[PDB]
UniProtKB/Swiss-Prot annotation, chain B:
Catalytic site: 132 (proton acceptor)
Binding positions for acetyl-CoA per the UniProt entry: 186, 189, 201
Result when mutating residue 171 to S: In NBIA1; uncertain significance
Range of the intact protein held here: 207 to 568 of 570
UniProt motif Nuclear export signal: location: 62-69
Effect of mutating residue 13 to V: In NBIA1; loss of enzyme activity; no effect on its mitochondrial localization
Effect seen on changing residue 198 to I: In NBIA1; no effect on enzyme activity or its inhibition by acetyl CoA
Effect after changing residue 145 to P: In NBIA1; no effect on enzyme activity
Consequence the record notes for mutating residue 315 to R: In NBIA1; loss of enzyme activity; no effect on its mitochondrial localization; loss of proteolytic cleavage to yield the mature form
Name of the molecule in the record: Pantothenate kinase 2, mitochondrial mature form
Length: 360, 362
């Protein structure tokens, strides 16, 4: 077995995801034998919810009483900005991390980008793993163990109507084939036919990084939480041109209802229209623009590949039920109920979990 | 049999209204005798001005010269104004007695529906409402058949990525079927066209010319489409976007994404340091690239799935926009290994108005 601490790391374009297994079956004789530095890092991780200026433990994602590699313990889910990787590597140097063990399993593009820095500054060797391989392994494992007596995955029934929208549970029991849409900084779209057989069908650079980046420019927001806050009190219809702004109603010949967006941000060439919108409106418009584009591309991929279940993951979906409901409606409405959107509780961490499972 | 002059086709879109006008160059003194005074003044109003009111523009360089149409010889003009100024156009309609020219005017686009009642009450005119996509098909097929004053209507870019070798070469739309037609307006409609009577709307995207123009106005303070493109021509998108390189330190080799490909459009703009580094021009360039490559990607997927190898891109998003045309041409060529060809047109934004004109003449 590998030595503690057991970590999986996913170094993305925007966020670094870190999954840590805290063993809870340490005997007296093990505690006796254990090194001070290991004891210190373990209590640093489990007694702090914030780490430095930017690191955060998502306490309510904690999976309790899992059995991994013959040990009973808890899974912790931790993230920080990729921008703060130099501080992270410096920490490994200063905390003597190579003495606990020299090799760590890491995925994401940062596993390649930062390899030399880890080696030179930290004296650490990365076991580099593919970001989409790790994603698949992680979602399947996290699904099979469940979420402390609740389901890992779910779907939205009647996602368009706030009068009847329900979040209902769903299992990946016999899940294949499935389309997996990974919404990070960019978007990858995977057709998955078994645990071992899958292909990257397409992607789009209009991802969560485009949402967050545009919001910062358009609204002066600086955090994702603030962007979403603004979006949840905004009205996109003031910013966008709807089909009814162009037709005065539906474009029935081609089944385009008046409420559908004809042109994203399409009113903003008008000074009068620009003057009447708020930062909140611009945030919401950015949200629906990016989401509906992804939804449309996933729909086309789903129908072409003859796949009816589409799973949406990635940290774009954090605190983003607005996006999840739009994606749900987008697939259901335009496919007349043939296509189904599925979502997950640990949306951003499956890659890091995959890196941890590889270790073990 | 044919209707009396004047002959017009109208396309009232989300952003622009397009008017096509056949100027007769075969008017006899005898016909003039029979013509009403409102017709005489409107004809000279159209031909002696290249700018109408506050915002009307005649695209003089598109004029089709010495055309024969329904037994009459003359020139076809192409005129545009913002849909925002429709109230003034309708009022001008009453001031210039448009109803004494004709009771009915042929109109396509969403605005043919939206402004119908206004045109009747204020303007004294009935609109003959016609389908925007049908008129688009009839217009491009007609305009291609006549050609552009000796030149071809449609064309492609050979070697679009390299300014050393980039060439605009003619493309004959004789036996063109099947083709994908990508109409880039405020929004985008994507058609698979199997014949002149047989086509379907495959899909579309709301991320269109209106998204490019709207975002550019918000992000840069530009007020015109021309300014937006001028700004984009002097910008560097790689300060704005996050490349595959920025994430991987090179290519993502497993799935063949080269280091230089965009991973996340506007992805650097979460960083305050990066935001302070960029200019208005960089943002305009990033906006142009993001909207264009997204349309290209979507069109590529439609073309491949429908087994269509020819994609004609139209709409006023592409007006004075050789940069976006070259990006579309490159992206389709590169990401399909030379299997898909991008085609473009000289009268990009006026095909629907032409269709409305042809409907008028039977
Ligand atoms: N606290 C946060 N900081 C930055 N981005 C966040 C945050 N919360 C959610 N996001 C969203 O998550 C996206 C990155 O998602 P992720 O799945 O981690 O992909 P990547 O591998 O590109 O980092 C961002 O583009 C943003 O939209
Ligand atoms: N002078 C202009 N004014 C406004 N938009 C322009 C102009 N020139 C080009 N455009 C572009 O053309 C688009 C409108 O395209 P068009 O094909 O006329 O569609 P629509 O029918 O939606 O008006 C705008 O969104 C903008 O991108
Ligand atoms: C480069 C990755 C794979 C990094 O996760 C992702 O950001 C992405 O797939 N971006 C855009 C993909 C595309 O243009 O198809
Ligand atoms: C509504 C029209 C047809 C009007 O030109 C056009 O703007 C459009 O096709 N918009 C995109 C709608 C969509 O496909 O989602
Ligand atoms: Cl006339």
């Amino acid at each position: 077995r590998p030595l503690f601490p057991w970590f999986g790391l996913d170094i993305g374009g925007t966020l670094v995801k870190l999954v840590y297994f805290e063993p809870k079956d340490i005997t007296a004789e093990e505690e006796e034998e254990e090194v001070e530095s290991l004891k210190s890092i373990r209590k640093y991780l489990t007694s702090n919810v914030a780490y430095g200026s930017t690191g955060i433990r998502d306490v309510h994602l904690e999976l309790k009483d899992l059995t991994l590699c013959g040990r009973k313990g808890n899974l912790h889910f931790i993230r920080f900005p990729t921008h703060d990787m130099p501080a992270f590597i410096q920490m490994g140097r200063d905390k003597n991390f190579s003495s606990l063990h020299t090799v760590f399993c890491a995925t994401g593009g940062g596993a390649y980008k930062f390899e030399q820095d880890f080696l030179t500054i930290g004296d650490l060797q990365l076991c580099k793993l593919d970001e989409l391989d790790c994603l698949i392994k992680g979602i399947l494992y996290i699904d099979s163990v469940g979420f402390n007596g609740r389901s890992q995955c779910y779907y939205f029934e009647n996602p368009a109507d706030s009068e009847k929208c329900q979040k209902l549970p769903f299992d990946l029991k016999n899940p294949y084939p499935l389309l997996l849409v990974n919404i990070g900084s960019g978007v990858s779209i995977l057709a998955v036919y078994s645990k071992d057989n899958y292909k990257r069908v397409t992607g789009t650079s209009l991802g969560g990084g485009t949402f967050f980046g545009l919001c910062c420019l358009l609204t002066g927001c600086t955090t994702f939480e603030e962007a979403l806050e603004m979006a949840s009190r905004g009205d996109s219809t003031k910013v966008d041109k709807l089909v009814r702004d162009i037709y005065g109603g539906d474009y029935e010949r081609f089944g385009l209802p008046g409420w559908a967006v004809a042109s994203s941000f399409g009113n903003m060439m008008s000074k009068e229209k620009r003057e009447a919108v708020s930062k909140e409106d611009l945030a919401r418009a950015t949200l629906i623009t990016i989401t509906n584009n992804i939804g449309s591309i996933a729909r086309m991929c789903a129908l072409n590949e003859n796949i009816n279940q589409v799973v949406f993951v990635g940290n774009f979906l954090r605190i983003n039920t607005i996006a999840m409901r739009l994606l749900a409606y987008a697939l259901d409405y335009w496919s007349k109920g043939q296509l189904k959107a599925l979502f997950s509780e640990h949306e951003g961490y499956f890659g890091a979990v995959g890196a941890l499972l590889e270790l073990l």
